[model samples]
Target chain A: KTIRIGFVGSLLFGLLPRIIHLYRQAHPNLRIELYEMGTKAQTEALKEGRIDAGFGRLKISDPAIKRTLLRNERLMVAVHASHPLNQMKDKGVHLNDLIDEKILLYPSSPKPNFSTHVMNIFSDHGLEPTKINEVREVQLALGLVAAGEGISLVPASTQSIQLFNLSYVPLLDPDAITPIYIAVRNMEESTYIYSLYETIRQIYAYEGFTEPPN
Target chain B: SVEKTIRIGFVGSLLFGLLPRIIHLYRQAHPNLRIELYEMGTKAQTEALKEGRIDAGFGRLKISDPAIKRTLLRNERLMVAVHASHPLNQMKDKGVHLNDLIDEKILLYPSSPKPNFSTHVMNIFSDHGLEPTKINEVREVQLALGLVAAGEGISLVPASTQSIQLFNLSYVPLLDPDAITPIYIAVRNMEESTYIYSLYETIRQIYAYEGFTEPPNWLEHH
Candidate 1:
C-alpha cells in the first residue's frame, strides 16, 4: 500500500503534501514515501526504479522516460525590498529596465537548463546586464536578492513562499516562464502512478490550468 | 612575435553600421593586429580613452582635450522617426520641418548630465525659435526609438540610425537646413603607429563609401 514519489525541491512544494493527504482519504491504506532532490537527482532516482514517478522542471530526453507537461510557472523579477525596482510594485519590471542592473541567476551548471532559458530571454532581447552572479540554487539566489546583492528572475509561484526582505515583481516579458513536468518510467498501466497524476492534474485544473494531455 | 591589439571603444549602435566590416577589412590587411571593441556610451568611451584603458574611441561628441587628436569621420543629418501609424508618417508629400514638430511630443535620447545628442536637438529647437511639447528624456536612442514605435512619442536620430529596423516605425528626412550631428574618431595625440594610421584610413574608406564627404572645418586646420 506504499508508493515512492520523487520530486525536485522547487516544484509542487506547497501542493504535493496537500494532494497526498487528499489521495490518502480516498485510499485509507496508502502510504507515500517522499524523496526530495534537485531535478537531476530525481531523474537518477526514477531511472534506478527507486521511485515510481518524479516531478521536475527539466525535459527528459531519454526515450525510455515518459513525461507530461504539468504547468509552466510565470517568471517574475525579485529585488530587495529597499531596491528602486521594488517601487514598480504591481506594475511589473520590463526586460529593458534590467540591463543596467546586475542579474542573479540560479543552478550555475555549465549545462543548459532553466537558468539558460532566463539568460537567453535577456540576450534575445539585446539586453546584457552590467554583471551576473551565478548561485547554487533558487533559494540562495532569492536570498542574495533580498540582501541587495543583485536582482533575480524567479518563478511567480515563489511569491507564495514569501522570503523576507524580497519583493517579487511580475516580469513583463511574456516569454518568461519556467516549465514544470511530471516524469515517470514508460509503464503505461501503473494504477498508483495514474492516480497520483490525476490528483495533481485536478489540483492544477482547479487552479485554472487545462491539464496537459497524456 | 606578439601581435598588437588596440582597445577600441565605440557606441553600441555602431554594431549595426560599417564599423564591423571596416574592422574585418583592417584585420585582413594587418593579420598580426587585433582589435577589441567595447560597446559603451560616448561619455564612457571618452573617459576610458583618457584613463588609458582604451587606445581609441569613436563618438559623436567633440572632445576638447588638447592631447587627443580628432578625425571627422562623417556628418549625419537628423532624421525624424515616428510610429508608422503616426500622422507625420502620412505626410510624405513634403519634408518634415522643425516647426511641424512644435506641437508634437518629442522623445529625446541620452538626456541629462552631459546632454550629448539631446543638446544638438535642443540647439535645433533654439535656432528655430520654437520648443517641443511634452519632451520626455530617455537614456538611450534604442529605448527612445522603442517608445516611438509604441506611439509614445517621436524622435530625431542620425540618418545612419535607420539601420536599426524596429517594428511600427517610419523614418523621415528632417528638413531643417542646419540640423546634423557629426561622427568623429578620437585617438591620443602621441606619435601614432603606422598601424593606427592604417586603421584610421580604413575608417575613412568606409565613410567615403557611405558618401560622407563634407569634412568639418576643424579638419582643414588638422
Candidate 2:
C-alpha cells in the first residue's frame, strides 16, 4: 500500500527528508508519495481523502480531521542582502523595528494559518507593518527578498536554502514562532500513518527539539 | 549612503559552526553592511586574505603572518557521530565517552595523516589510553558523516554540527575534556576598516552571550 503524505515548506528541507529516509528504511515494501501544497490545500486534500496525512504550519479546522502538534518552529526574518537591518548589532530582530519596511507575506492567497501567526506577532506588539507584499509561495517570498523587493518573515528552516542575496535573522519577540502539525482523517486508521508519525516524533525527540506532548 | 559589503571566508566546518549564528548577529548590528561568504580551507582562506580577496577568515588551522592578527574565538567541543540505530544513541543521559569507543571501527575526518583532525582524534585516544579496532580516513567531514549514516563506521565532528541532521545518524557529545578544536578569526594586522572592527566586536559579544569561555558538558542534556 502507498502512503500519500502532503507537506508544506521548510519541514521538507528540515525533518521531512530524514523522516522519509528512515521510514523508507523500515518499511521498504510500503511506498510513500509526497505532495507539495500550502497548508489550506493540504487540509482540503486530507478531508477529500487525496492524502493519508498532511504536515504543515497551520491548524486544520475540518471536524473529522485529527490534528497533532509536531513542533513549534521559530520564525526568522528574511531581508535583502543589503538591507540596513542586516547590519544591526543586536542578536535578534524586533518585530517593532519591522513596522516601517515593506513586509513580504507568503502563500499570497488561500492564506494559511501562517499569516495568522505573523499577524499575531504584530498585534502582540500593538503594531503592524505599514506595507505588505504578498507572494504565492514561501520560495517566491524568499526570492523576492533576495531580489531586494521587501523583507519577509520566514521559518528558521528556510535558512537551509543559503541563498546568496538573502539572510535569515531570528526574531527576538517571544511570540515570533509558529507550530507545525500533522493532520489525518479522524476515523481513518492506518498502520502506515501511525508508524510514519511515530518515526517523525522519534526523530524530533532524538534531535532534542521540542516535540508535542502526548 | 552606500552599503559596505564584508567579505568573509571560512572552511566548510565553520559554515556549520558558530559562523552562521555570528553572521546572523552581525547582520542585525549593521543592516547597512552586506556579507559575502567564501568556502575554502584554512590555507586558502589565509592566502585569500593576504591577497586582499577577503576581509576576514574563520577556521581551525593556525597561520602565522606578521601582517595578520588573529583572535582566538573559543575551543569548540568535538562530538561523535554514530548511526541513530547505534547503541550509543540509547545512552542519551551520559553520552559516549572515549573509552566506550574502544574495539569499534572509527572514521577520521580530512582523510589526511599529517597534523589534521585525524591526528587530533589519535591524540584524544592516546590521552585516554585506548585505541580503536580500526580507523578509516575520509576525505571530507561531509563524506565521513555520510559514511556514518551508512553504518560503515562512526566519525568525530565538531559540536556545532548538531545543526546538521542527516538520516540514520545522531551526534552524541564526546565526553572528553581534551576533545576540542580551536576556532580563530583572522584579519589583516594593518589599518582595519571600522566595519571590520564592528564585525569583530559582534563576534566577541556572540561568544560572550553563549558563554563560550566556559567548557560545556553539551551531551549531558541534549
Candidate 3:
C-alpha cells in the first residue's frame, strides 16, 4: 500500500490542502492522512506514536526526530507602505526608529520569539522603547499598523496580509529570520514528503531563497 | 475603543470548545480585547470566509480553492473508541491504528458538513483495504459514543472526543497506522481591519506557543 502521510493538523490552512491536492492529482492511488491539531497536540500525538509523519514546527532539541528547512522568512518591520521608513532602501532599520513610538505586537509563539529578539537588539543598540499599544494576534497588529496606530514586526508568511498602506522591509542589517521547516519521524517511509519538499524548494527558489537543505 | 467584541466563527467538531477558551485566555493576556465565538459547520465557515463576514474561522477543509488563504494552525490526531470495558480496553495504548479494528463494527456520525467525519472513517477503512461496515450513523459524536457504550459498535473519532467515559464502552488506540484527521483556520485573501487581523494573529500565536505540544485547554472536559 502507498504509505499514508500523516499531517499535523487541519490548520495548515489552505496551503497544505492545495499542495496535497496537487500531489494527489499526480499520484491518484496514493492517499495522504492529515491530522489537524494544535501545536502541543501534534507533539503529544507524535510522542505517543499516533501519527506516521508530521508538519509544523519542531524544536531542534527534539532528540528522536529530524527536520528539513522548507522555507525561510524574516520578521520585518511592517509599517505603513507610505511611511518614511518604508521608503528607505537600506539593508535594515535601526531599533531606535521604534523608540518613543507605539508598537503593536501579536502574542503568538513566534511573536514572543520576535519580541525577545527585538528587545535584545534594542538593548544591544542601547535603546529602551515605550509600549503605547499591544495585541495578541498578527491580523490585529497589522490592522493597528494600518490605522497608523503603530508599526509592528511580522514574518514573511504573514505577508499574505495585504493592507493598503502596509510595507514589508527586510531586516538586512541584523535580519531576524523565521524559518519554516518540514519535520518527520522517518522521511524514507513517507516518500511523498520528498516530493512535497521539492515543491516547496521550487517555490522558495522562485522567491530568491535557496533550496532548503535536504 | 470600548473593548470591541468580535464574533469569531468555528467549524463544528471536537475543537468546538477551544475557541471560547482561547479568546478568554487571550483577553486576559491582552485585557484590552474581547472575542465572541460563533459555531457553524465547516461549509458555513467557508461561506463566511467567502462572504467577508466572519473575522476568522477554524475547521477542517478537504479542499482549498484560490479564493482563501490559510496558515498551518495545528495538527489533529484521529482516534478509535470502543466500550471502555470492552475486551480490548486494557490492551489499548495511545495512537492505536485503525486497521487493528478491522473485525469490529464501526459506529459513525455525520456531524461536520464537509463530511470530514464520514470521509475520515472511510479513509481509515480504505487505509486497511476494507470498507466501513457503517452499522450505525448518528447525529453527533456523543450519540456514537453512546452506541459504542451500549455494545452496539465501535466508533472512530478525533482524539479530543474520545475522552468522555461511558458505561461498558472503552476507548482503544487505533494501531493500524493509517488514521489521521486535519483541522484548519481559514481567512480572506484580501485586506482586513486591524483588530480583525490581530484576532487572527492571536489564534496563530496560541498555536505557535504550543508548537508540537498538546493543545492547552481543549474540549471534552480536560
Candidate 4:
C-alpha cells in the first residue's frame, strides 16, 4: 500500500514535492515515504529492497537496478555576493574563471557523488580548481558560501537557495550540465514504478528545458 | 540562428519554486519560442516590460506601473518559518496570531528592495500594531530560512515555500486576516496576449488540481 522513494538532495527542489504531491493525490491509498540518499547508497537500498525507486545524479551500474536518465541539468557556480564573479552575472563566467576560486563540494561521503561529477565537469574542460574543500551536504556548503568562505557549483535548481551574500552565476560553456537519473530494481515492474516515472516526466515536461538555465 | 526569445522576469525567491515547471510546460507547447528568465523586483519588472526587455514578469508586490497591465493572479497567504524546536511548532497547523509572535525575534528579508515582500511583511505588523521584540534583516528568503532553521530568528515566507521541507524547521501559517501577499503577472499594456491569458488559466487550473483554495483576502474585488 506504500511506495518508498528516494531522491538526492540536489534534485530535492520544489519539483520533487510537486511530483510527489501529484502522485500522492492520484494514489492516496499508496503511501509515499521519502528517503535522502546518494546514487551508490540508492543502488544498495534498491538491492536490499529498502527503496522502490531513486532520483539522483549518479549513474552507477547496478546489476539489479535499472537506470533511466533525465535531461541534462545545467550547472551554476554559486558565489558570495561580494565575490567578483557577480560582475559576470549578465555574461556568465567561463570554466577558467573558477580555476582559482575555492570550490566547495558536497556529500563529503560515498564515492561517485555530485562532487565528483562537478570535478569531472571542470577537468573535462581541462580546468582544475586551486583549492577543493569537501562538505557534508549542500546546505552546509551553501551556508559556508554565504558566510563568504568560498564558492560552490550546484544544479541550476539550487537557485532556490538564496541569501543576500549568495548568487548563482551561469557557466559560459555550452555543455556545463549534469543529468538526473531514475533508478529502480531491474526485476520490479510494478505500476507504481512506471507511474512515478510518468509523474516525474509530467512535471519536468511542464518546464520545458528548451530554454537555457536561468 | 535568430530565434524568437520570450524573456520572462521573476523576483528572487520564485527562481527556486514552481515557476520552472510552469515555464517548461509553456515551452513544450510553444516549442518554437525560446524563453529566458530575468531576476528582478516588481519595479525593475515594470521597467523591463515597458522597454520590451522582458515580455512578462512574475512578482509579489502590488505595483503602480499602469503603463504595464498587472493581473492579480492570486493572494498567497503568508506563513511564519520557525525552528523545529520552537514552541510555535507545537501550535502547528492550527497557526498563530501575528500578535502572539510579538515576543519572538522577527526576521525581515530581501532588505534591499524598497517596496518588497519584506515591506509587505512589515505592513502586516503595523496594521496589527504588533511590534516584534527584536528584528533582523536578512538578504533573501533562503538565508532567512537558514537562520530560522538554526533557531537564530523567525522569518516570514510565501505559502508556496511550505513545500520546502528543510530539516529542523517547521512552517506555521498566520491566523490573521491580512497575512497574505499577492502574486501578480505584469506584462506590457497591450493588448493582453494569448500567452498571458494562457498562463493565467494554467495557474488557476493547477491550484484547483492541487487542492489550493483562493479564499478572498483583503484585496478581493468582490
lDDT of all predictions: 0.71, 0.73, 0.58, 0.74
Model 2 TM-score (B-chain only): 0.82
iRMSD (1 decimal) for each model = 20.6, 8.2, 16.6, 13.3
- What CA RMSD would you report for each candidate? 19.8, 11.9, 18.5, 17.5
Per-residue lDDT of candidate 3, residues B1-222 (tens digit): 557665567654533224433554455565565555555666777778788667677776655767776654565666667755556677776545555666777777775454667766786677668765545566566556544553456788776564344434455666554465666766776666576666655666666665745455431111
List the candidates' TM-scores in order.
0.51, 0.50, 0.45, 0.53
**Chain A fold similarity by TM-score, each prediction:** 0.85, 0.86, 0.71, 0.88
Q: What is the Å distance of residue B116 in model 4 from its true position?
A: 1.4
Tell how far residue A80 is off in model 1, in angstroms: 40
Q: Give me the runs in candidate 1 sitting further than 4 Å from their true place.
A: A1-214, B214-222
Pairs clashing in candidate 4? Answer: A81-A165, A160-B16, A206-B24, A206-B25, A207-B24, A207-B25, A208-B24
Q: After superposition, how far is residue A143 of candidate 2 from its true place, in Å?
A: 16
Ten-residue segment with the worst summed lDDT in candidate 1 chain B?
B213-222
The lDDT of model 1 is 0.71
**Model 4, span A1-214: residue lDDT tens:** 7888877766645356556656766786776767666788888999999999888887688678888777777888888766899889888998788888888898687777788888887888788887998876676566556644578888887776565456889987877888877787876458887787777777777877432221
lDDT of 1 at B171: 88
Model 2: per-residue Cα lDDT over A134-211, one tens digit each: 655565566446645578898887675555456777888777888888888785557787788788878888899766
State the weakest 10-residue window (summed lDDT) of model 3 chain A.
A5-14
Q: For candidate 1, lDDT tens digit of each residue in B1-222?
A: 437877777764454455655765676677787666655567777678777888878887876777687777766788898877678888744668889888888988775466478887988899878877679777566556655654556998887677555555678888877878877778777766676778777876766777766555533221
Q: Is candidate 3 or candidate 4 better by DockQ?
A: 4
Clashes of 1: 0
Q: Which should have the higher TM-score, number 3 or number 4?
A: 4
